[PDB]
Design a protein around this ligand. Structure first.
Ligand SMILES: [Mg+2]
Ligand SMILES: [Mg+2]
Ligand SMILES: [Mg+2]
Ligand SMILES: [Mg+2]
Ligand SMILES: [Mg+2]
Ligand SMILES: [Mg+2]
Ligand SMILES: [Mg+2]
Ligand SMILES: [Zn+2]
Lengths: 55, 197, 101, 66
RNA sequence: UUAAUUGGAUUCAACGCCGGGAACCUCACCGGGGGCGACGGCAGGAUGAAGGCCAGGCUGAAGGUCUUGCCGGACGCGCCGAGAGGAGGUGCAUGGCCGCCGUCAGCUCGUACCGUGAGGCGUCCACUUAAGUGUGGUAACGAGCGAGACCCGCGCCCCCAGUUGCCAGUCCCUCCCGCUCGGGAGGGAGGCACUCUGGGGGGACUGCCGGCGAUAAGCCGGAGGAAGGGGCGGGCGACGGUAGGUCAGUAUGCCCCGAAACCCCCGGGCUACACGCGCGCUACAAUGGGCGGGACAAUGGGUGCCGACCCCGAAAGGGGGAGGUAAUCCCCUAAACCCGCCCUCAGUUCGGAUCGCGGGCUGCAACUCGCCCGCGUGAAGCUGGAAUCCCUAGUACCCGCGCGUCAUCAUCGCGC
């Protein structure tokens, strides 16, 4: 089968189990209260997600 | 709990908006809003060209609904387009207008003065543009144009002014455009008057 | 009787007081007692992050924050009012939940 | 360095030379008289305006005006 | 040093930094194996192309190939151009973002005047301020952005609220002690008194006295006050520069790879060790070590998850399992501190590195290389050369706790 040599594996833990919902990278991903984004994308989309910086 | 509800239904809008930006790149997609009622939702898109967004008599919105319901949430959608609230006081439309004008072939100085004259005509207090790329050379540069009062730091220059950013791909490279417009009702704290007798 | 219990919760503070006073007035106009809006503790979600993409330069951080205001109302059940609080038409950034005891 | 600001003088001098009799020397009297003659919505701004006008009137009435 | 020990950063402003606590993946690195050309044309194709399997060899393992013969029903990398895809090159081709000069006090404009001109004046002088913040004089008179104002917390008072929060004064019942006159503990009925939670107002202005300075800007001292002279702590970083860092977060032009430098899978490495260095943790003991008792917190988190309560085990842990989508149930009776007994200035009852054997948890997999428990063995270390760092008040020092990363593992980061 030529569909058995370009197909991945279903991980369920470890850095390779989750990827950013908008960029697509593994690594530093935010998992607080559910949203799943980079540390880089959350910083330039937050003020539209509702957040604000008070201090 | 309840926070997991609030910040799960705030992300869907982010994704929908960030996709429709690309898709309706032209016709100047202005922004949207979701009204969630029983038995289904209802989407609104303030385009700048109802013709192009609708399609050829309704042969595009079908694809928009199927795509917006199969890849996204929004189990029962109903789209309809509208016309912009104030296209000359919304920075994130002027940014794309100037970016388009640039990548069509105009020189970068005619575009900026056209835009600033139009904006300060339709009744703004102050505007500021800033272009920076590989224009006229092989070492990059940066230029600035402005007209009047415009606050830059503090709290008032975070909620009153309107700012937007865009790109403009070309044959050499990219060019960034960044606008910032002040609505005609500024009312900074310093503007104290005397209600007289 | 059976003392319905309604729980509003929203992120904009102003747009909550107006539905609160709607409920208060509706109750008042008809004949029914009520326990005024009892403020419950705010739940503020906080997210600390770095600031620079690369790793060079000093280390400076951000503090994003999101606050969620809650309330609580106790009221009796009269269909003249139990219905009157159905055409109330909450805004889109508010949550409402009704349940009796 | 409690330097009086720039835009506080430029209005206190305008309403101390417009209603020169509605302003006594009391602090808490002027402090009420200021909120309703203007459209100020702050709270620490009316206090400094009141203080400056009180200084002004007690410095003028007693003679030389600087 | 190695088959590979992948790269970027080198004074401030590189070295617990790339959220970098890497068993597989993450992964870019060494050994091996297999898949991938939308689209236009070429050899060929219903006498049947592309394309798929029970069993057996090769193989680390595999219809991946070959042996074996079954099937499927139209296309065709065996040929040419193109095209996906690229953690491949270039931050000295760019965008966006961020560090530093610097939360420093600067940077300009309109008109007029002075110079043939680059330019100047305003923006200079005198005193004052945290400040190009002010008050006076002046070929200057007015303005814009930065500073201040603005936003969020803390400390004091008042009004409106009373459940899932609190229980003082009344009212019943039960139970204990000097046997009860007195005192104490639980319930349940009722109430928002006090605390608390959080919406709205009040309060401080050099305002009031004395002295400097001109009599102006302003600066010292004293009251009354919960608070005093930006009230205390934070958020917000101007025009520009730094050919500073990032193409290895996303976006992106040019040049190379294009049956490979693209896409998957198994095993290794980033954890190697004569050595120089940065930041930390534990000690060198009495301003202490051990054993038994006694005291008092806050922030935060939980449905792929938090586990009260009961029972097995010496300990790690194991078998059951209420209540919780949250001011309700759970994490959660903190440690330094105090009283009583042993040690008595010793490489020790100080110090616990290094090693042997046995029991467990997470995991698809614990040798390379995870974490936890019990018994045993017991290294350097007796206060530190020239040098150098951080701190002005609920601050420095000393002691513990919670989130993040996370299937397990905190000498770290950010808060209490
Ligand atoms: Mg690996
Ligand atoms: Mg400078
Ligand atoms: Mg550079
Ligand atoms: Mg360089
Ligand atoms: Mg390493
Ligand atoms: Mg010992
Ligand atoms: Mg091991
Ligand atoms: Zn991302």
């Amino acid at each position: 089968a030529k569909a058995d040599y370009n197909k991945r594996k279903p991980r369920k833990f470890g850095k390779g189990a989750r990827r950013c919902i908008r960029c697509g990278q593994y690594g530093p991903i935010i998992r607080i209260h559910g949203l799943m984004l980079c540390r880089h994308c959350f910083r330039e989309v937050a003020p539209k997600l509702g957040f604000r910086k008070y201090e | 709990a309840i926070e997991r509800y609030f910040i799960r239904e705030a992300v869907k809008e982010m994704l929908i908006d960030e996709f429709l930006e690309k898709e309706l790149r032209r016709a100047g997609y202005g922004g949207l809003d979701i009204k969630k009622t029983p038995l289904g939702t209802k989407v609104i898109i303030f385009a700048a060209n109802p013709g192009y967004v609708i399609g050829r008599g309704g042969r595009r919105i079908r694809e928009l609904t199927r795509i917006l319901e199969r890849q996204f949430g929004l189990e029962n959608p109903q789209i309809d387009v509208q016309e912009i609230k104030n296209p000359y006081l919304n920075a994130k439309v002027q940014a794309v207008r100037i970016a388009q004008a640039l990548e069509r072939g105009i020189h970068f100085r005619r575009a900026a003065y056209a835009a600033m004259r139009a904006i300060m005509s339709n009744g703004a207090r102050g505007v500021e543009i800033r272009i920076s790329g590989k224009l006229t050379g092989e070492r990059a540069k940066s230029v600035r144009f402005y007209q009047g009062y415009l606050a830059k730091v503090g709290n008032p220059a975070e909620t009153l002014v309107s700012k937007g950013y865009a790109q403009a791909l070309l044959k050499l490279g990219v060019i960034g455009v960044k606008v910032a417009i002040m609505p005609p009702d500024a009312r900074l704290p310093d503007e104290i008057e005397i209600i007289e007798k | 009787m059976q003392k319905a219990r309604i729980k509003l919760a929203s992120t904009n503070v102003r747009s909550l007081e107006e539905v609160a006073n709607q409920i208060k007035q509706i109750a008042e106009r008809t004949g029914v007692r009520m326990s005024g809006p009892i403020p419950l503790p705010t739940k503020r979600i906080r997210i600390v992050t770095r600031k620079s993409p690369d790793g060079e330069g000093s280390a400076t951080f951000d503090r994003w924050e999101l606050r969620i205001h809650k309330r609580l109302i106790d009221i009796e059940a009269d269909e003249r009012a139990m219905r009157q609080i159905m055409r109330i038409r909450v805004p889109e950034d508010v949550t409402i939940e009704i349940e009796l005891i | 360095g409690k330097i009086r600001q720039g835009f506080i003088k430029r209005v206190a001098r305008e309403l101390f030379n417009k209603y020169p009799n509605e302003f006594t020397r009391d602090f808490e009297h002027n402090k009420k008289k200021v909120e309703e003659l203007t459209n100020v919505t702050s709270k620490k701004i009316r206090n400094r305006i009141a203080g400056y006008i009180t200084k002004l009137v007690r410095m003028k009435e007693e003679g030389k005006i600087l």
